[PDB]
Design an enzyme around this catalytic site. Sequence first.
Site, PDB file in Angstrom:
ATOM      1  N   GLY A  41      -9.766  -1.046   1.674  1.00 42.54           N
ATOM      2  CA  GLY A  41      -8.861  -0.126   0.999  1.00 42.54           C
ATOM      3  C   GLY A  41      -9.078  -0.053  -0.504  1.00 42.54           C
ATOM      4  O   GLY A  41      -8.595  -0.902  -1.256  1.00 42.54           O
TER       5      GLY A  41
ATOM      6  N   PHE B 208      -8.171   2.461  -2.951  1.00 38.73           N
ATOM      7  CA  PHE B 208      -7.071   2.951  -3.794  1.00 38.73           C
ATOM      8  C   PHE B 208      -5.704   2.418  -3.347  1.00 38.73           C
ATOM      9  O   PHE B 208      -4.673   2.743  -3.948  1.00 38.73           O
ATOM     10  CB  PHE B 208      -7.068   4.493  -3.814  1.00 38.73           C
TER      11      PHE B 208
ATOM     12  N   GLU C  98      -3.804   0.199   0.454  1.00 42.50           N
ATOM     13  CA  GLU C  98      -3.987  -0.543   1.709  1.00 42.50           C
ATOM     14  C   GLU C  98      -3.402   0.175   2.927  1.00 42.50           C
ATOM     15  O   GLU C  98      -2.674   1.151   2.791  1.00 42.50           O
ATOM     16  CB  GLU C  98      -3.404  -1.958   1.591  1.00 42.50           C
ATOM     17  CG  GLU C  98      -3.998  -2.759   0.448  1.00 42.50           C
ATOM     18  CD  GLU C  98      -3.524  -4.195   0.396  1.00 42.50           C
ATOM     19  OE1 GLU C  98      -2.955  -4.695   1.395  1.00 42.50           O
ATOM     20  OE2 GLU C  98      -3.740  -4.830  -0.660  1.00 42.50           O
ATOM     21  N   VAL C  99      -3.731  -0.316   4.116  1.00 46.72           N
ATOM     22  CA  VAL C  99      -3.222   0.256   5.353  1.00 46.72           C
ATOM     23  C   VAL C  99      -2.854  -0.875   6.300  1.00 46.72           C
ATOM     24  O   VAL C  99      -3.704  -1.680   6.672  1.00 46.72           O
ATOM     25  CB  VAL C  99      -4.257   1.197   6.005  1.00 46.72           C
ATOM     26  CG1 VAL C  99      -3.959   1.391   7.476  1.00 46.72           C
ATOM     27  CG2 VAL C  99      -4.297   2.549   5.285  1.00 46.72           C
TER      28      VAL C  99
ATOM     29  N   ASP D 209      -9.342  17.830   2.206  1.00 46.53           N
ATOM     30  CA  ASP D 209     -10.299  16.754   2.523  1.00 46.53           C
ATOM     31  C   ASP D 209     -10.338  16.507   4.022  1.00 46.53           C
ATOM     32  O   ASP D 209     -10.069  15.392   4.496  1.00 46.53           O
ATOM     33  CB  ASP D 209     -10.000  15.461   1.755  1.00 46.53           C
ATOM     34  CG  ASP D 209     -11.168  14.448   1.810  1.00 46.53           C
ATOM     35  OD1 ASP D 209     -12.332  14.813   2.137  1.00 46.53           O
ATOM     36  OD2 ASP D 209     -10.917  13.263   1.505  1.00 46.53           O
TER      37      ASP D 209
HETATM   38  C1  LIG Z   1     -11.856   5.818   8.568  1.00 51.39           C
HETATM   39  C2  LIG Z   1     -11.284   4.684   7.708  1.00 51.39           C
HETATM   40  C3  LIG Z   1      -9.809   4.410   7.992  1.00 51.39           C
HETATM   41  O1  LIG Z   1      -8.933   5.068   7.447  1.00 51.39           O
HETATM   42  N1  LIG Z   1      -9.565   3.495   8.937  1.00 51.39           N
HETATM   43  C4  LIG Z   1      -8.349   3.245   9.514  1.00 51.39           C
HETATM   44  C5  LIG Z   1      -8.308   2.282  10.530  1.00 51.39           C
HETATM   45  C6  LIG Z   1      -7.099   1.972  11.156  1.00 51.39           C
HETATM   46  C7  LIG Z   1      -5.926   2.632  10.779  1.00 51.39           C
HETATM   47  N2  LIG Z   1      -4.758   2.333  11.400  1.00 51.39           N
HETATM   48  C8  LIG Z   1      -3.626   2.945  11.039  1.00 51.39           C
HETATM   49  N3  LIG Z   1      -3.613   3.872  10.070  1.00 51.39           N
HETATM   50  C9  LIG Z   1      -4.742   4.222   9.414  1.00 51.39           C
HETATM   51  N4  LIG Z   1      -4.714   5.162   8.424  1.00 51.39           N
HETATM   52  C10 LIG Z   1      -3.648   5.868   7.961  1.00 51.39           C
HETATM   53  C11 LIG Z   1      -3.885   6.802   6.953  1.00 51.39           C
HETATM   54  C12 LIG Z   1      -2.837   7.553   6.421  1.00 51.39           C
HETATM   55  C13 LIG Z   1      -1.540   7.375   6.909  1.00 51.39           C
HETATM   56  C14 LIG Z   1      -1.305   6.452   7.934  1.00 51.39           C
HETATM   57  C15 LIG Z   1      -2.355   5.697   8.451  1.00 51.39           C
HETATM   58  C16 LIG Z   1      -5.948   3.590   9.765  1.00 51.39           C
HETATM   59  C17 LIG Z   1      -7.160   3.895   9.137  1.00 51.39           C
END
Ligand SMILES: */C=C\C(=O)Nc1ccc2ncnc(Nc3ccccc3)c2c1
Length: 251
Positions: free
Chosen positions: A21, A23, A25-26, A122
Amino acid sequence: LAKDAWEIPRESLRLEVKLGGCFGEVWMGTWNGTTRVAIKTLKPFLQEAQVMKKLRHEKLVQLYAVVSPIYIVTEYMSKGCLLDFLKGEMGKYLRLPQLVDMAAQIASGMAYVERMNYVHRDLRAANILVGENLVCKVADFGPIKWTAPEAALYGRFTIKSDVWSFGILLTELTTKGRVPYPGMVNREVLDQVERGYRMPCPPECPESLHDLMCQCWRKDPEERPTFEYLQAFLEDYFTSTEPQYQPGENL
Ligand SMILES: */C=C\C(=O)Nc1ccc2ncnc(Nc3ccccc3)c2c1
């Protein structure tokens, strides 16, 4: 500050696993004990955010809550991003039928975006999420290889420049996730596309689908089709356009 009804307290959200991540985190999470959520954090002027809030469709990842540091809470997509799903393990098994279906769902999420007079800006596999049962949903509303010329050059972003990206995402789907314009670097792509170059038919991909790609890549934004055309042509693909399709080694 004057929060809206999307606003929750930071204390309501329980963060668990890290998932990805640059910019921010997720995370996978649990929302006030009951509800599994994904949580997109940001590194320390919104809305912008009025876009995630006003859009609601089945093929777009659903916002649940926002915070103020700044947090964005959403439905949980179990298979992560489409880019990773495609080049991972369950990529040697995908064939055109599954791929055109995934393509049909994104077109429909984007057809909604079109009826609403919005623009994504995007669109690309890295920004599509996959859930169970090969469900795909458009995410991350707010690099040039996916971007239409008029917008990489003149900031002229429109639904029609989204169509163009759609066509690039179609090459992603049909190559199991390869970077498009392989062997070309950003400048060569800009220079060569301006001069009329377009990615050729991907190995094994039918001509009628590459032809859809080419329609998506017309020089005049206006002559590019709608996401509604795209959605419809894709859903009906195997009756109306390739009734005599047969699986090959890769597609
Ligand atoms: C392609 C890279 C990436 O974004 N991987 C990714 C893996 C697993 C995930 N699990 C849950 N959510 C997300 N992304 C997300 C993006 C915007 C809003 C909510 C969730 C990802 C992303």
